[PDB]
Each structure stands twice: as structure tokens, then as C-alpha cells.
Amino acid sequence: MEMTSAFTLNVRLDNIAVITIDVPGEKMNTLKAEFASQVRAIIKQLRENKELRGVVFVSAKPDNFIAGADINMIGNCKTAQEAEALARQGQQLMAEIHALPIQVIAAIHGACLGGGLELALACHGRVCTDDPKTVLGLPEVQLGLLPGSGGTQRLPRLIGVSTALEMILTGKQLRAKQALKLGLVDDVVPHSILLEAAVELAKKERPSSRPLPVRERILAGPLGRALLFKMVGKKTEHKTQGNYPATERILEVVETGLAQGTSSGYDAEARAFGELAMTPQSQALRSIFFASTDVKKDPGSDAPPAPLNSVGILGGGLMGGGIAYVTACKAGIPVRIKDINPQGINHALKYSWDQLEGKVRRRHLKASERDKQLALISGTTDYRGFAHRDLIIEAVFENLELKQQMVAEVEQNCAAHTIFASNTSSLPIGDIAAHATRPEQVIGLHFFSPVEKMPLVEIIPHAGTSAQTIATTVKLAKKQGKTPIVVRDKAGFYVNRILAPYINEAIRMLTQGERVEHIDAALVKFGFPVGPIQLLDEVGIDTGTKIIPVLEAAYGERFSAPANVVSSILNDDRKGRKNGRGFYLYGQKGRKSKKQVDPAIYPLIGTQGQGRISAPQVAERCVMLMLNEAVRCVDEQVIRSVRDGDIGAVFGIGFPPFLGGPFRYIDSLGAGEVVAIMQRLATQYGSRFTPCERLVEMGARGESFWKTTA
Amino acid sequence: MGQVLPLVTRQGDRIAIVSGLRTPFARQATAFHGIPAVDLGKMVVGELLARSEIPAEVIEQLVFGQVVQMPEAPNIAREIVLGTGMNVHTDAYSVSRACATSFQAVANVAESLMAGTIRAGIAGGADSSSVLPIGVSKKLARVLVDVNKARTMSQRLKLFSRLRLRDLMPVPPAVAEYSTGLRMGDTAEQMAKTYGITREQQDALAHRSHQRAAQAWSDGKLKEEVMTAFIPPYKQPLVEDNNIRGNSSLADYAKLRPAFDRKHGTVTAANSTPLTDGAAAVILMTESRAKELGLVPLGYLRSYAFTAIDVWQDMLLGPAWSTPLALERAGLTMSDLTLIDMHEAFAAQTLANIQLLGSERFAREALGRAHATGEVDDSKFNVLGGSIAYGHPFAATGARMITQTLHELRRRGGGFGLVTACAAGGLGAAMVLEAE
Amino acid sequence: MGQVLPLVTRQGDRIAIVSGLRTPFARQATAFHGIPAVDLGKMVVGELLARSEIPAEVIEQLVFGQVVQMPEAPNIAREIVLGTGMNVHTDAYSVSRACATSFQAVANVAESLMAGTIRAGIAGGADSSSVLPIGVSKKLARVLVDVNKARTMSQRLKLFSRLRLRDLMPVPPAVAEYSTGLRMGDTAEQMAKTYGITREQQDALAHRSHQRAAQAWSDGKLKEEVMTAFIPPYKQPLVEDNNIRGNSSLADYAKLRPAFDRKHGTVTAANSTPLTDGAAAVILMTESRAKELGLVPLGYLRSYAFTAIDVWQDMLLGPAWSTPLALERAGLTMSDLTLIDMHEAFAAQTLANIQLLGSERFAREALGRAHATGEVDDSKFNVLGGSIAYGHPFAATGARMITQTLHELRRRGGGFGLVTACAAGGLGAAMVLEAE
């Protein structure tokens, strides 16, 4: 009934019929084949009792108008024909709705995403609520998939191609104000009068006045379309490097939709959707999206958490400000800083000021909003007001005795129910706790480079750590809009543990007379953003060595780094951006070129002879060490779940998403074949490439990784 | 009958003063440059609650007054609640009574909660001499009032015909009394001519206060009630008042030409408060509520007085009139006073007050009292320096005396402190502290 | 007495209220054109004093206030004492509270009278919408500060080198909330949109507000509260309010464009209160003092309430929130309430208020009270119309409608009236009258 017929129709006393959208499955109004099926029954019933003013569509749910098309059924498709026909039935149904001669209104509240825009493109009248929660967007190119159903060619028909194409290539979120500004939505009305405002517009009959485009988008088809298509494709290839599908396909389907007609775009959209549904990057993104939803839906600790209303920060500075800026601007929770030097208070406050100042400089936020956001920030040098801080984070130096000093004073000079979070980089959490009144309320929060960039952090409990402490921690990071992952309290934890071999062999090769262009291009071409050397420039060469000495102390020569390079750079201080005088100098003339390389670094480094081999040889050897280490950490289960392990590597470090993550990639690479690949490199180069015991155990047997992967 | 005023609620609980804080003062056109007094008030109160660490829902009312009232926000007190994280349901409104706003701000709040309408209240005041709301001439204002109401386009040009070269010049502000036209120092100068105040003794107290002033920061006792300012540029925080020049000589004071009466006046910049900017606020909240939520009050309240007198002559004698009223309401004695303090508006007016406070005749005839108030012991008189040192942020002047007084009486036995201040328009105000 | 609180003074005598005066309200340009707010108080108070058998020395404190403020005379009440022929030792005092300055000033005198500090006083407020202060651009305010503090001529030209753009013309005042940006009537549209109030559901209340009031002038029932305005030009004296238009039909002004939304603006200018000019003063002085000098009190007082709510959604419900507090403080009932009245600032909103007043749900959840405060009786509601007629001087509308209430209750010969008004920033007030 209405459960199946989620489009429960109702004709009012007037000549206007209202159609609800209430799928009983969940609060998200998703699209199902049954929904596509029963709507034909409803529209046929709508054909019954004709001669009425019009029809309207409502969200009928306080959260969203429509979630979009379900992808689980798309994942159940096998070949192109299933996907081609799936587009075709979508292509026909939208035009069939568009074939109506009366005024059709989509009064949308909340999120309208995915296939809803295709439906929105079908309706002649479109109106949306004024709430910030509502938004319009085509989120599928991020999935490596095109949403071909007619809207991909109706939107450039509806709106200038200058904005339509970037919408398709960069499927994003558009404000109701923005859409009305460009004319996508006919009008914006408050949620209270959202339904009624549609009624008179629906009764208003056939506004046969199509708004004109910018008049610069008429080039689609005639001269200009190819110039636009050439410029975007070349820039995209300059951007995406061509290892991402569903980019040129958009250019093809748009051109044939524009320069060859809607039907020509229709068939191409069906055909392109078919051939692309099984592209290996597609399900790579789909599986990646699955874990992202899974971790977002994951509650972390199974124990119920505790209320969180006030937080403390020990020490200050730029690093301290990063937590402070996020906690106020993102989490919106009161925070107290206790840097003894007011300059440390001054610096952290200045940093958060600068972060918010640019937003207002863009007119992104109101000036009063800054004052409202600045209100959550509090600094001092004493423990007053800290007595009621539920959580405390240290932004202090990593001296162990000082760390045990930190836990003692905060225990002495705060509440008892309060928990403590440690932002360590080297010292173990239980080692940090050591002697503690309530070590179970002490948790390890491995933060990273400027936290506003990467939303990933490490959850590091120790032998004694209350599950509720994690539960509060897990809720907090999510409440901070971040990515909590429980990492076993092990030397190197997970991320920095696996990151060390990456630059290690890179330096080993770089010491053997490698040039900047070859080493840089090798990694960036293999789907790895920001190459190693510029990565070390930004993270800081001083931090480039990090705490890798303990890595040899913990796991032997496998993490050994070559000598007379860290020495050759620490003495002649070249920290990248920490000192500014990295091998990538700034202030170059024009300042419109790649970061220049010093010629003097090569003599400073050993630079043994000249570079050899090729980028794949560099790429294959570098990657396998992470793979050899990624299996290694999960071999002792540093990470609790395989998907948790895969998501961290693909999202935090920057593993190529089109590879689906290393666990997908090794599943994609299969079995001992890649294991066989990594012994020949060991023989020709050295014993750093020894296989992991499980790596041969799984590889030789042909074992899979993504559960029932193969 | 002894006109004593028991300052207790309906239940009989006396009024408690748990704490307060003062924003450090800066001269005009200093680190507090371009900083509206609302911003200074916002930062102090937010920190004060943070320093007080008490819940904001406990506070049931706040009142904030302002000298040099600003046009954009008529009721800045409500603006603070909106500007801060204070609960909106807190009944914020603004007042204005000369320089004794702080005395006024506590008084109306106290009597309201003494009546029992609320249980927790906030009083505060601030001013910023660095920022001025300078306006256009009155005649130009009427023309602009005419033009916006004008209906015809051609009417405006004829309406704009009436213009003058001096009409465009903005009017500078003035400090002289509106109904009198005499500056505050002019009143002090004639009293200096009246009762006899030589510049050397006028300069001597400035030396005494200044030595007491710098020593206070040298002792650093005025730290727990004074915040360290932070500025949005975040170049460097400010810690101490710039006005205090405690390294001075009495001869240096005598090397200034008189300001108002350049012929016989005995007052200069040395013996006159300059224009300083700052903020202050104090929590007003009854002992029963304090005990209920577990705080120790920084003293209590015993009595207070307010008086209005003639503005033409002897206009700055208000505390002298108010003092017996406060003492009679307190049912106490000048001897029954650990510390005595008055607002050091001018050296000329101050010494006359002690003279007049000890003047048997004046109290006998002008006040009609049986005896004079008494002689002011200089040992307990302005122990921590005074207004000729910190400066005059106008509204915060009341609280800055309160903080030091309670702390100084906290530094000693319970005792009884005295706080008085004169005001323009012949307005006098007095208040009596218990400090347990 | 968990909800009812006595309002009786310390001596056991109830609080008498005596006859007061209202300056006849005039539009911002028709009459009182160019008249300041201070002098408006001077005539009304001067004539109010020369209206009863009390001498000037009986009064001991007068508290005024103005929502629109002038930089000169921050305590306008002092010039009231000084400008008029008045005891120069009366506690002159000024406050500031938008749209309810009259109510708060009345409360201030009462609480001062609660302890017995003041035995006879005048409470009121002044408002003039023809002398609006026009400030200069804020950028050209520190430059004026800088040039005032400028030392050398070379620095000034460097300081003046930066003047450019649109810094020349002044900044007109705006009614929009400082931290909300709401024009005080746009928030009325959304409430009407929120609670579904038709433009024809209203515009008849406006008619009945315009009606019952033109009758009142015709009946002259409100003659004893209003003096006859005299203009210094003396072209003509003004006795009857000019704003009132109690002759247009309810359908005559319904044919007007929307005011704010201009798309769904079910409220317009005709069904909104217009700004006018006037002042009011009422003799507040206790029963014993009234009895002993031989003057009849113009009724009495039972209880009062002031309330603040979040100014983001439906902030004009202050009277609705304030009303049960006033009743519970009086220990009375909405049914046991002879005659009521409303500030009636806008169409709708109040219609929503009565809708919300009788809405059991709202008090169940928004106020937590087990029951709604109840509905209203229209016959007992705006018997003489109200602000949609006479006008809306911010500091004068308050005292006005109590004076009309008491005398009408005198025409009704007793009962318990009620007076409420809504204020900007989510502020509301309620107070319960006892006409013996």
C-alpha cells in the first residue's frame, strides 16, 4: 500500500493534487525500482480525472526531499545491458513525467540529492524551503559514475553549460540562494509556507517563458563547445591525470546531448552508463564509500558515552590552536587554554583568528558569528575554571617525565569524573599514564599535521582505558566532524608506523642520484597526491625524521634510514616550511611556477652516481613496502577490522582511491603473484623487500582480503 | 530615631558580594584604541564567569551603565547577553547616573533582590575615552530631518540652499555641566580658592598616591582582580595600567602650568585624573544563594547613601553630605572604620573634603548635624594610592575602589571600609562595606 | 505564598498611585516638530505638579528615561529638576530600556519606595521622534579623535590623506536589531505566517482599535489624563491627539500593499502602530504619605512582572510570558480580571498572543505551567481602543495606558485591570492593577 506506494497521492478540495514521498524503509527518501514501478500506476491514476489546475510534490519528511537512486541494486547489476537498461527506464520515466501538459511542482524540503535532481529537472515548477538543511546536488562523479537519465542533458539545456559541466564533473552542494540566483529553483520560501506557496504557483498555469541563459553558453554545439571541451579535458587530464574514468565520458555524453540532440545524449547516456558501471574504479569508489558510511554509522566503543560540555587544553601555540579552533568552530564546545606564556595564548588565539578571518574575508560568515565563535575560546595560565572540564588535551612538549607531570597536575587541579586525552607523537599511552589515579580516563589522541586539512586521527587506548572514555572520544571526534579509528597501543601506532618505509627507500633511491622530476612524477602519477619530498617540505624535515629511531629499536633494520642525509640536512637547517628555507624556496619571481629545487642539495645529499630504472620500478617498490607493512600491522591486528585498515590507508596517507585502497589493490592484485613480484626486487636490490609471513601465507594459498573478495 | 537601614531581604538574609574584576586601564589613544566599551565589557564578563567558574544559569539579572553613552546600542546591557554566551532569559537593561553609575548600578539591583525579585545579579560599568561619538551641528541635523521627509525632488535643492561653511564642522564634546557651563576642575579651583588648597599640597598627595600606586604593582597585589587584555591584532597582551607614574618628584609636579585657572589655579595635569579607558563588573548575589550553591562572599554590604546638592557652588562636596547619611544608615562611626576611601577626582576638592569632614561648623549648619563627621586618618585614607594614579574610566571608578577595598580589608581583619565618590550636577554618593 | 508576593512597604502601608498626566501624542512632523524630549517632560511634569495639592518639596526622587537618547544630558531627569522650578535636592535619575522605559522607571521608584528610601516620587519617560540624533560615519570618528589628539600640522594632512569613498554622508538610524537585523515588524510577519493570522482576521481589530477611541475623544472620557499642549510659537494649542483616525472603515485600509515581505506581508503600515511624540508622568507615592498630606490615590497596585526571552523566533511574546507571572505574583486569575489592555504594537502577534494565551499547549511546554493563562474577553480588552490610534512614543506609551486604565476602571467603579507591553530584544512586561 502506502508503504510500497510511497508516492501517496491526495487531491485537495481544489483542482490541485499533492504527492507525498515517504519510503517506510528509513528517513532517507531513496529511489527503488518499485518506486519507479508504482509511480507509473500513480501517474496513470493521475491521468484519470483530468482537467485540474496541477500537481505538487512534497518532501513529506522533515529531513530530506529525496536521498536519490539506490546503488546497492546498481552493484547487483552485472553487465552493460543491465546498466544501460537501468538508465533507459530512468530516461523514459523522467520524460514520461515531463510529458504531462499541466503544471507540476516539486516543493522540496531538506536534502534533494542524486536522482531527485533528475526528477527536479523534469518538473516545470521547482520550489525549495529556506532552511540551510536543504540542498541540491549530483553526488556521483565522486563515485566514478555518471547519473545519466536525461538530467545530465536537461541541466545544460536548463542552465548555461559553463556551470552545468562543472556541476557534473564536480558534483557538489548548491545553496537555495545560489540556485535561485542562477535560476535553477523557481523560488525560495519558508518551510512553514512551503506547501501553500506551491499551491498558487501550481494553480498558475503554463508559464511558457523559458529564462534565457548567460548568452555565453550558446556555444554548445557551435564554435566554443569544442574549445570549452578541449580546455576542460586538458585541464582535467592535467588535474585527474587520466587514472579516473567518468571524465571524458561526461564530455562525450554532454556534447552528443548538446551538439547532437537530447535523444543522441539519451542513447550515449544509456550506453556510457552501461560500459562504466563495472569500471574497476567504480566499485573501488563504491566500496570505499561503503566503509565511510560504515565508520560514520559506527559508534566506536560499545559502552554508552558520557556527556561532554567543557574541555581543557594544556599549553598553546599553532599546534594547540588547531584543536582550539576546531573545538569552538566545529564542535562548538567551551574550551580553556592554559599556556603559561601569554604569547602562547596570544599565538593560538591569533591562529584561530586568522582561520576565521579568511572566512569573513570571503564573506562566508558574519562578523557577529566570528564573535559568537570567538566566545567559545578561553585562555589563561592557571587551573581556575578547569575544575569542571570533562576532557583535557595537552599541547605540550613530549617529555615523558613532563607527561607524567601533566597527568598528575590535571588530576590534582580538575574534576574526578573528567577524562584526559593525550596528543602524543612518540610515547606510549600506558607509558605516558604509568602512575595515574584514573588511567582508564586517559586516552591517546594521535593528531597530525594541521588538523583542519586531514579529518583522520588515531584512537590509542592502553591496557587500562575505560570503554566510556573511548565512547566519549569516538563521539567527540565525530562531533568534531573527524575520523576516529582505534589503533593498537604499539610502537609507531599505525600511520607513522607504515609511513616510515615510504620515504625510507625513496631517500635510498634519492641517494643514488635520483632527480626531482623522476621521483616526484613516479609517485604522483600512481594516484598518490603530494610527492614525498614536497611532503617532507610541508610536514617539516625536522619532523621528517619524526621518531624513526625507535622504529629500528622496535622493529629492527626494516625501518632503518640511510645515514649522512638526515645528518647532512639537520646541520644545514633545511626544514622545508618550518624554517621556510627548504629545498623548495618561496618568493620566486612571478610566483606562478612549481616550487623550485636547490642545485646545492644534490651535493649536500650523497647523490650516488645517476638515476636509473623507471617510474613504475620506483612506484612498485615504494608501494609494496607499505603493502608489506600494511599487512604487517594487521598481521598483529594493529587495526581491529580489515575495512578499518583499508579505509585509514586510502584516506589518511593518500592511497589512490581508484585502486579502492591497498586491501582492494592487493585483492585486485590477487595472490602470491604480487608476492612473487616482490622477491625479484628483493634479489636485485636488497633484503628490505622480504615478504610478510601472512603475505606468503595468504598469497600462496590465493586467499582474499575483503572477506569474500575472491 | 536612629535612621538605620538594614540591608536584608524579606527572609532577613543580608546582601553578599562574592567577587568582581576590573579590566586594566589604558590612557586615551592607547592599546584600547578603537575598542568600543561594549567589547571591553564583553571580554571581562565572559572571563569573569570563566574565572568565577559558576554556572551562567545561576545569574538572574544583569545591569550595565555607561558614561559617554553611545548611539548604536541604547541598552548595551542586553547587547552583552546577546554578545556573550549568557542565557537570554536574564533581564538586562541599562542605567545612567553621572560618574556614580557603579554605585547606582549595584543599588537598584541590590534593592530589587533585597525585595526578593531575584537571587543573583550582575552590575558593571565601563567607558572608553579613546572613542568619541562626535556628531554634526544641530542646525545641520534639522535640515537632514527635513530632507528625508521631503516629497518633491526640486524641494530638496531649495531645502539644501540654507548652508554654511561652519555647518559641516562636527561639534567636539564637552565636559562642563550643561546647566552651569563650568568644567569639573573649575568647581575644584574655586573650592581651592574657597577653603585654601595650595598646589604644593595638591601636588604632594599626587606624589603620595603615585608612590603608593607603583608600589602596588611592585607589590603586585592588584593582580587577582585585574585581567590581562588580549587584542584582536594579538601583537602582545597588556598587564598593567600605563597611567601610574610612581617614579616622580614633587618638584616635577610643580613644573606644570595650571590648566583651568592659568593665573591662580592650583591644579594641573599632575594633580588631576586623566582620561583613561577600562571596564569593571561585580557579581551581586545574596548570602543565602551563595551558601546554597557554595561560595564564600568577598565581604558583604552594610549601607549606602546618595545625595543631590546645588550645582553652582560647592558642587563636588557630595560625599561630605552623603557620608553622615551612610553612617547613620549603617549605624556606625568614622572611628568604627578600618579603612576610609574617597574618589580622588581632584587634589583641590579632596583636601577640602577632609577639612570639611572635620569642619564642625559646616556640618552644624549646612548639614544641620550635631557634630562634624570627623577627621580622615591618612594612614587608612587611600592606602593603595587612588584616582590620581590609575585614571578615570568614569564608570569603572566605583568598582576599582571596591575591589581594592574588599581585598585590603581581606588583607586585614574584617573591619569596615568606606567608599565615596562625588559626581557632576551636585550629585553625591556613598556606600559602606562590611567585608565580614 | 509560593507564587503570590506582597507588594506592601516595610511599614505595612500599600503602595498608592496618584493622578498623572500625559502629553497629548502628536505625529513626528504634524506637531511637536523640532521639540526635544527633555522639554516635553518639563511641561507635563511642571503642569502635573501644578495640578494636585502637593508642593514641590514633597517629591523626593524622579526617575525618567528615553529609548531615543541624546549625547547631551545623559541623566535627562537632572535637567527636569534643574530646568523646571523644582527642589534641587530631589533624586533625579534616568534609565534606558526600549519600549518599556516607562514600566521600568515605575518599578525603580517603587522598589526605592519599598524600603522607605523615597516617600514621594514621579516616574515617567520622555520621547520625541522629531529630534532624532544623526551621527557621522564611524570611520570619520577616530580620525576626529586622531585630529583632536594630533600634534603637528604635517600629521593631520597625512591623517586626512585617507579620506575617500562614501565616508562623507552620515549613517541614518535603523530600527533593525543590532545582533539580529530584524526591523521589528518583519518578525511580526513570520509570527503571522507561523500562526496563520489573516490580514482580514486583523484590520478589524485595527478598526475596533480605531473605534472605541474616536468615541473616547468624542465622549471625552480620557480628558483627565491629558494636558493641552502649548507650542512656544503659540500658533495654536493642541488638546486632541492627531494620530487617531477612528473613522476609516475596516475595509478602507485593507486595500494596501504589504509592508515588509511585499510578497506575503499580511501586515502593513495601517495595521501597525505609528511613531509619535509625547511624554508622561505619574505621581507614585505611598498610601501613608498620600493620606497624611491629604491626596486621593488614583488606585493602587497588585503585582508586576518583567520577562526576557530569546530574540530569534517569536520574541514579541513577552507579555504572554509575563502575564502569568503577574497573576501568580498577585495570586489572581485571568477570569478574575476586570478589564484588560494591550500595547497593540502590530496587527497579528497580539492575535497570536491571545491565541497563545488561550493555547493550553504553549504554557504546557513553553512555560511548563499545567494550564494556559486563558483566553481574553474582547469587551474587557481595549475598551478605549489603544496604540493603533493614539500613537507610539516609546517612553510615553507605558504610563499612558495605566492612566487610561485606572480612570476607566473608575468609570467601571473598581475591579482589577491588567496592562502589558512588548519590547524589543525579546523583552516583555506585565503588571496587575488594583483600582481599590
Question: How many CB atoms sit inside 10 A of residue C173's CB?
Answer: 13
Contacting subunits of B (3+ beta carbon pairs below 8 A): A, C
| Beta sheet of A9-11, edge-to-edge order | A9-11, A16-19, A54-58, A103-108, A125-129, A187-189
C179 contacts A368? CB cut-off 8 A: yes
Experiment type: cryo-EM
Give the type of residue at B127.
D
**Residue partners of A10: CB distance under 8 A and separation at least 6:** A17, A18, A19, A20
Q: Is B83 touching A (CB cutoff 8 A)?
A: yes
Q: Which residue's C-alpha cell is 564530455? A: A251
Catalytic residues of A: 458
Of C34, C91, C95, the CB nearest to B142: C34
Q: What is the 3-state secondary structure (H, E, C) of A396-421?
A: CCCCHHHHHHHHHHHHHCCCCCCEEE
Judged by a CB distance cut-off of 8 A, whether residue C379 touches chain A is no
- Best mutation target among C78, C304, C313 (most B Cβ atoms within 10 Å) is C78
Taking Cα atoms as reference points, which of B24, B22, B20, B21 lies closest to residue B229? B24
- Burial class of residue C355, CB neighbours in 10 A (0-12, 13-18, 19+): middle
Give the CA distances from residue A53 to residues A96, A103, A106, A200, C224, in Å, rounded to whole numbers and listed in that order.
Answer: 19, 7, 15, 10, 61
Q: How far apart are CA B306 and CA B296, in angstroms?
A: 29
Contact A653, A625 (CB under 8 A): no
Which of B50, B83, B228 comes nearest A342 by C-beta? Answer: B228
Domain locations along chain C? 186-220+300-434
Helix A532-539 and helix A495-511: axis angle, to 10°? 120
Q: Is A190 on the interface with C (CB under 8 A)?
A: yes
Distance CA B274, CA B27 (A): 8
Whether B173 and chain C come into contact, CB under 8 Å, resolves to: yes
Residue whose entry in the numeric block shows the C-alpha cell 510577519: C189
Task: Give the phi and the psi of residue A91 in degrees, each rounded to 5.
Answer: -60, -45
Do A478 and A603 sit in the same domain of this protein? no
Rounded to an integer, what distance in angstroms lies between the CA atom of residue C120 and that of residue A30?
73
Residue window 329-368, chain A: list those with CB within 8 Å of chain C.
368
- Is C99 annotated as catalytic? yes
Q: Does C198 touch chain A (CB under 8 A)?
A: no
C-alpha grid cell, residue A626: 607499505
**Interface mutation vs chain B, best among C32, C42, C72, C93, most B CBs within 10 Å:** C93
Contact C136 B141 (CB under 8 A): no
Give contacts of A317 with chain B, Cβ < 8 Å: none
- Is A293 contained in some domain? no
- Boundary-marking domain end, from A486, A515, A544: A486
Measured over the CA atoms of residue B254, residue B256, residue B262 and residue B267, the dihedral's sign is negative
B230 with A345: Cβ contact below 8 A: yes
Out of C82, C98, C134, closest to residue B75 by CB: C98
A363 and A446 inside one domain: yes
Q: Using the beta-carbon criterion (under 8 Å), do A190 and C193 form an inter-chain contact?
A: yes
Domain boundary among A444, A470, A486: A486
Under an 8 A CB cutoff, do A384 and B83 touch?
A: no
Q: How far apart are CA A143 and CA A70, in angstroms?
A: 13
Amino acid (one-letter) located at A210: R
B329 vs C: CB within 8 A: no
CATH number where A421 lies = 3.40.50.720
Sign of the Cα torsion B72, B78, B79, B80 reads positive
Domain C186-220+300-434 = CATH 3.40.47.10: yes
Instruction: Pick C194's closest partner by Cβ from A192, A197, A368.
Output: A192
**For residue A193, what is the nearest residue in chain C, using CA coordinates?**
C193
Same domain for A543 and A410: no
* CB contact (8 A) between residue B236 and residue A343: yes
* A188 chain-C contacts, CB cut-off 8 A: none
- Chains linked to C by 3 or more Cβ pairs within 8 Å: A, B
**Which has the closest alpha carbon to A49: A104, A10, A21, A93?**
A10
A349 vs B228, B230, B236: nearest CB: B230
In a domain, A162, yes or no: yes
Show which of residues 280-309 on chain C sit within 8 Å of chain B, judged by CB atoms.
306-309
Q: What is the CATH number of the domain that holds A50?
A: 3.90.226.10
Q: Are the C-beta atoms of C425 and B78 separated by less than 8 Å?
A: yes
Q: Residue A583 is part of which domain span?
A: 492-614
A640, part of any domain: no
Min Cα distance A477 → chain B (Å) is 23
The domain B184-222+243-266+301-433 is placed in CATH, from the list 3.40.47.10, 3.10.28.10, 3.40.50.720, 3.90.1150.10, at 3.40.47.10
Report the number of distinct structural domains present in chain A: 3
User: Which set of grid coordinates corresponds to residue B355?
Assistant: 577639612
In a domain, A36, yes or no: yes
> A202-205: long-range contacts (C-beta < 8 A, 24 or more apart)?
A202/A16, A202/A53, A202/A54, A202/A55, A202/A56, A202/A103, A202/A104, A202/A105, A202/A125, A203/A14, A203/A15, A203/A16, A203/A53, A203/A54, A203/A103, A204/A103, A205/A53, A205/A54, A205/A102, A205/A103
Write out residues 167-186 of C within 8 Å (CB-CB) of A.
179
B-contacting residues of C 88-117, CB under 8 Å? 88-98, 104, 108, 111-112, 114-115, 117
Q: What is the CA radius of gyration of chain B?
A: 23
Which letter does DSSP use for residue C381 in this model? B
Q: How far apart are CA C291 and CA A231, in angstroms?
A: 95
- A387 vs B53, B83, B232: nearest CB: B53
Check if C194 contacts A (Cβ < 8 Å). Answer: yes
Residue C311 backbone dihedrals phi, psi, to 5 degrees: -90, 80
Does A465 lie in the same domain as A543? no
Q: CA-CA distance, A95 to A263, in Å (whole number)? A: 11
Give the Cα-Cα-Cα angle B246, B251, B256 (nearest 5 degrees): 90
A504 in the same domain as A460: no
- What are the distances in angstroms from CA A392 to CA A438, B320, C351? 13, 54, 51
Resolution (A): 4.1
The chains in contact with chain A, meaning 3 or more Cβ pairs closer than 8 Å, are B, C
Residue type, A213: P
Q: How close B358 gets to chain A, by Cα (Å)?
A: 46
What single-letter amino acid sits at A240? T
**In a shared domain, residues A191 and A207:** yes
- Beta-carbon contacts of A170 under 8 Å, excluding residues fewer than 6 positions away, are A141
Catalytic residue among B210, B343, B392, B407: B392
Is the separation of the CB atoms in A54 and A203 below 8 Å?
Answer: yes
- Side chain identity at A287, as an amino acid letter? S
The DSSP symbol for A232 reads H
Question: Which of B29, B89, B108 has its CB closest to that of C309?
Answer: B89
What is the rounded CA–CA span in Å between residue A382 and residue A395? 15
Any domain includes A89: yes
User: What residues of B are in contact with residue C79 (Cβ under 8 Å)?
Assistant: 178-179
Residue A646 belongs to a domain: no
Judging by DSSP bridges, how do beta strands A135-137 and B301-308 pair with one another? unpaired
- Residue C57: its H or E element: none
Closest residue of chain B to A386, computed from CA coordinates: B53
* 3-class SS letters over chain B: CCCCCCCECCCCCECECCCEEECCCEECCCCCCCCCHHHHHHHHHHHHHHHHCCCHHHCCEEEEEECCCCCCCCCHHHHHHHHCCCCCCCCEEEEECCCCHHHHHHHHHHHHHHHCCCCEEEEEEEECCCCCCCECCHHHHHHHHHHHHCCCHHHHHHHCCCCCCCCCCCECCCCCCCCCCCCHHHHHHHHHHHHHCCHHHHHHHHHHHHHHHHHHHHHCCCCCCECCECCCCCCCCECCCCCCCCCCCHHHHHCCCCCCCCCCCCCCCCCECCEEEEEEEEEEECHHHHHHHCCCCCCEEEEEEEEECCCCCCCCCHHHHHHHHHHHHHCCCCCCCCEEEECCCEHHHHHHHHHHHCCHHHHHHCCCCCCCCCCCCCCCECCCCCHHHHCECCCHHHHHHHHHHHHHHHHCCCCCEEEEEEECCCEEEEEEECCC
Nearest chain C residue (CA) to A367: C179
- Candidates B409, B412, B416, B414; CA nearest to B430 is B416
Q: Which residues of B touch C175 (CB under 8 A)?
A: none
**By the 8 A CB rule, do A652 and A454 touch?**
yes
Active-site position among B99, B207, B210, B343: B99
Q: Which of A586, A614, A642 is the last residue of a domain?
A: A614
Strand order from edge to edge, sheet including B339-342: B301-308, B427-433, B417-423, B339-342
